[PDB]
């Protein structure tokens, strides 16, 4: 479980705070104009809660996607993307003057994702 990791993890990081949040995500834009981008970000769920009372929100009805650049910015409505199981939907909105940094996105987490094993 613990092994290869310099040395200690105590009187090293003089801080001891904030080490869970595993990342590594990997978004790729495909639209009928210029598709071929790779973007890294993930899928963001305010409404938490998508177990079980749900069908109302009241609280979360729209995911966002975090960015780490311009990429998904350009990313205008009408795109589709894949990210890890290889979906990713643009649900921003542009009621004639799009180009709003909030990313919110929409997924479909299909089957096929290349899978290789």
């Given at each position: 479980?613990?092994?290869f ?13 904030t ?26 769920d ?7 009372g ?12 975090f ?37 919110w996105?929409?997924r479909?987490?299909?089957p ?6």
């Amino acid at each position: 479980m613990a092994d290869f990791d310099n040395l200690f993890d105590a009187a090293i990081a003089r801080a001891d705070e904030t080490i869970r949040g595993y990342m590594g995500t990997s978004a790729t834009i495909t639209s009928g104009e210029q598709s071929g981008a790779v973007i890294r970000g993930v899928f963001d769920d305010p409404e938490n809660i998508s177990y079980a009372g749900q069908g109302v929100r009241v609280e979360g009805s729209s995911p966002s996607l975090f960015v780490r650049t311009d990429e998904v910015r350009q990313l205008r409505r009408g795109d589709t993307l894949t990210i890890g199981e290889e979906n990713f939907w643009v649900d921003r909105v542009s009621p004639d003057d799009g180009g709003s940094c909030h990313l919110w996105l929409g997924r479909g987490v299909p089957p096929a994702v290349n899978r290789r094993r």
